[PDB]
Homo-oligomer: A and B are copies of this chain.
Amino acid sequence: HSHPALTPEQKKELSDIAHRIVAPGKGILAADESTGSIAKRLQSIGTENTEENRRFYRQLLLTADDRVNPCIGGVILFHETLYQKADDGRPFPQVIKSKGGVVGIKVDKGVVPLAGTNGETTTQGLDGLSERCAQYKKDGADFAKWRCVLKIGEHTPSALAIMENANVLARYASICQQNGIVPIVEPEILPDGDHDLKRCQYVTEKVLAAVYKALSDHHIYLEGTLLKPNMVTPGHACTQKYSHEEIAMATVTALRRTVPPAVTGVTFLSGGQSEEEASINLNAINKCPLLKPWALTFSYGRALQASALKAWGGKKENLKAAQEEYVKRALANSLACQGKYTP
């Protein structure tokens, strides 16, 4: 029969956290990056990857001025970032809360190959995820991140890949909700290949339908969840060009056909597009004439920090310049989230 996965108090707490994350005008700063994931970004400048460099970069992202507060509703942190401190001794989660944001943590442990598939991968990280999520909850993290990676090929994504990614996302969501942490479901579809907008929309619809069927199967409280889907965009190698309005229409149509309205908000990821392109696409999505029952906010790792990283240059002199670049990008992304961004 009906065995309640969450009590009404747990559901209320999850809904409150989720609505706080994607409150109107607020988005997510995806500051989560592994040691090797941020290694390439720090090597783009020439500055070495150390604990102090990582801490200072994340402090620069997190210790922005008051203008970021109504634009960042959540920050996804890496495991080490959740336990680093600001220059004044303030812990990074407490820095995030003091600015009105919601502390998040990347709980997935990377992607692993799926045998018998054309390079398809599934995401691991469910081992001890209950204890890890409980500890993150005691450490200030109120929501979690789980990146499931799918791509588009001549035979990809297959039934096995979509099914397994949806199942692992549903299990991660169940664990996070049991631990009082809002799960952000991220069935990312890589914009790699020559696939057009139509194929990306079809694949996104299939992936999201399977993801939400798995969430229903795992008794996931959708009001206590957020979605982190790829923007429906043509592949990087696609020759045909689509306008921002076309991309927005395709993305909103894909979301409306799969995502139930109970989902508190949809926090898009950049997916390899430039900062200006991501902001304009988010603005067009929020300006789509189709009725959108969810908060179509942003959860950007590169689209919010690329300019700040370039301006910073790895040296302390450009702290203010990089902070200003990140702040103006967050302002632009919040405007796009409200649909009022005009570059």
Identify the A interface with B (CB < 8 A). 1-6, 109, 112-118, 122, 124-130, 154-155, 159-160, 163-164, 167, 171, 174-175, 177-178, 198-199, 202-203, 205-206, 209-210, 212-213, 216-219, 222-223, 253, 256-262, 291-293
The answer to whether B125 touches A112, judged by C-beta atoms less than 8 angstroms apart, is: no
- Expressed in whole angstroms, the minimum distance between the Cβ of A204 and any Cβ of chain B is 11
The residue from B163, B216, B258 contacting A205, defined by CB atoms under 8 A apart: B216
The answer to whether A222 touches B257, judged by C-beta atoms less than 8 angstroms apart, is: yes
The answer to whether A253 touches B258, judged by C-beta atoms less than 8 angstroms apart, is: no
The answer to whether B218 touches A213, judged by C-beta atoms less than 8 angstroms apart, is: no
The residue from B129, B213, B218, B257 contacting A116, defined by CB atoms under 8 A apart: B218
Other 17 A-B pairs with CB < 8 A, given A163-B167, A260-B260? A1-B202, A112-B130, A112-B175, A114-B174, A114-B218, A115-B177, A115-B218, A116-B174, A117-B219, A159-B159, A160-B217, A160-B218, A160-B219, A163-B217, A212-B213, A257-B262, A261-B292
- Expressed in whole angstroms, the minimum distance between the Cβ of A68 and any Cβ of chain B is 28
The answer to whether B256 touches A6, judged by C-beta atoms less than 8 angstroms apart, is: no
Q: How far is it, in angstroms, between the C-alpha of A118 and the C-alpha of B259 when the chains are bound?
A: 26
The answer to whether A3 touches B117, judged by C-beta atoms less than 8 angstroms apart, is: yes
- Expressed in whole angstroms, the minimum distance between the Cβ of A5 and any Cβ of chain B is 4
The answer to whether A155 touches B217, judged by C-beta atoms less than 8 angstroms apart, is: no
The residue from B1, B155, B222, B293 contacting A291, defined by CB atoms under 8 A apart: B293
Q: How far is it, in angstroms, between the C-alpha of A129 and the C-alpha of B110 when the chains are bound?
A: 13
Given known contacts A116-B174, A116-B219, A217-B160, is B128 in contact with A126 (CB within 8 Å)? no
The answer to whether B155 touches A1, judged by C-beta atoms less than 8 angstroms apart, is: yes
Across the interface, which residues of B come within 8 angstroms of A171, CB to CB? 122, 164
The answer to whether B160 touches A115, judged by C-beta atoms less than 8 angstroms apart, is: no
- Expressed in whole angstroms, the minimum distance between the Cβ of A242 and any Cβ of chain B is 15
- Expressed in whole angstroms, the minimum distance between the Cβ of A19 and any Cβ of chain B is 12
The answer to whether A199 touches B6, judged by C-beta atoms less than 8 angstroms apart, is: no
Across the interface, which residues of B come within 8 angstroms of A159, CB to CB? 159, 217
The answer to whether B198 touches A2, judged by C-beta atoms less than 8 angstroms apart, is: yes
Q: How far is it, in angstroms, between the C-alpha of A253 and the C-alpha of B223 when the chains are bound?
A: 10
Across the interface, which residues of B come within 8 angstroms of A202, CB to CB? 1-2
Q: How far is it, in angstroms, between the C-alpha of A128 and the C-alpha of B115 when the chains are bound?
A: 15
- Expressed in whole angstroms, the minimum distance between the Cβ of A295 and any Cβ of chain B is 11
The answer to whether B262 touches A116, judged by C-beta atoms less than 8 angstroms apart, is: no
Across the interface, which residues of B come within 8 angstroms of A175, CB to CB? 112, 115
Q: How far is it, in angstroms, between the C-alpha of A125 and the C-alpha of B167 when the chains are bound?
A: 15
Q: How far is it, in angstroms, between the C-alpha of A261 and the C-alpha of B292 when the chains are bound?
A: 8
The residue from B3, B199, B259 contacting A2, defined by CB atoms under 8 A apart: B199
